[PDB]
Symmetry: D2
Subunit: 114 residues, 4 copies
């Protein structure tokens, strides 16, 4: 099944933050309505934030997270959780090899913002 794709409410601000836990440099690309809205990169084996930014979902509200290493498209796992019917978390984990460490790159999308 497709992973890393989320439908957010239209024209809404959301935060995107990426963490790295791999020996390899992680590249996180965020597409909003099929257009690159943010691109983060970094190397860390201690969960360092390699990028954090505030974006807007636009008309379609279609947000897609892609993760790659040296061009190598990483396999993703994802899900959305909503608490008390108002607080949203779109979560993504990625694997750059065969290590079931879908933690090589972790991406957290949250909304609404202040």
């Amino acid at each position: 099944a497709t992973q890393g794709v989320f439908t957010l409410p239209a024209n809404t601000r959301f935060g995107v933050t990426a963490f790295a836990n791999s020996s390899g440099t992680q590249t996180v690309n965020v597409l909003v309505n099929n257009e690159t809205a943010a691109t983060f990169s970094g190397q860390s084996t201690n969960n360092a934030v390699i990028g954090t930014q505030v974006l807007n979902s636009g008309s379609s509200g279609k947000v897609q997270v892609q993760v790659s290493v040296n061009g190598r498209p990483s396999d993703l796992v994802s899900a959305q959780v909503i608490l008390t019917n108002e607080l949203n978390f779109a979560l993504v984990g990625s694997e750059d090899g065969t290590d079931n460490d879908y933690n090589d790159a972790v991406v957290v999308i949250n909304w609404p913002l202040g």
Copy 2:
């Protein structure tokens, strides 16, 4: 925080199912747009599916789950989880005592159907 309240897409059919795991008789009420749309009840300490029904979210899309035992409101816990940006689970757990057991009455709402 409020628990057991979920906003579903408008005019959408959804399934609602209740489970019981308590010595006491459980009563589950499902409200759509603040009006009782379904009621289930039963007494089982073996996860019996005490009731199930297909409802329509209506114009508001507001669905609320209430659980009571002997007329007393149980302590509810809930969350919504979306898989592959399409499969929705609105989950409710409840405690009717003080044993830290939130499976006394469980309610699962899922959509889309068909």
Copy 3:
């Protein structure tokens, strides 16, 4: 990524219930510690329960759900959620066609019972 596999706490009773929303009969197998422990078969286009059973996680706690329709395995999506650090849900959705909602066979697992 691997889907439909969950590690449950050992010596724990858990419920497993399957719902169907497909024109074809759904086959759901639940393997506990590499041995089939429950098998459901049914058809519904109204989210009806096609099977429900309370199982024991045993000594290891490995639980795997397999879904097939007319002999062909269905693609799965899954996740585990824990509420108030006590109530556990293991969720599985399955797709037997080209739709993207994975509701043909839906499985809900809850514990500790």
Copy 4:
């Protein structure tokens, strides 16, 4: 029900990150094994990361998040989710429920 308390595997490193989205200064305290292990304080209405650290869950594995705003304890909402049976997230919201948001993730690199 109790919220903001999570049982992680013992002696396991995890990340804890806090975001602020409120007019008031958020005070986020992280208790590991019931002892203060980290504290973040900041104001933002633009999801600023007011804190992010890696901590060890210790012998007990108990992690509790506390949020207050100038002496007023915030009501919390929380849940834990596990993806592909290996990637864990512990989530917390607070109301002074996006005033202070905390995300915990494990296991690390």
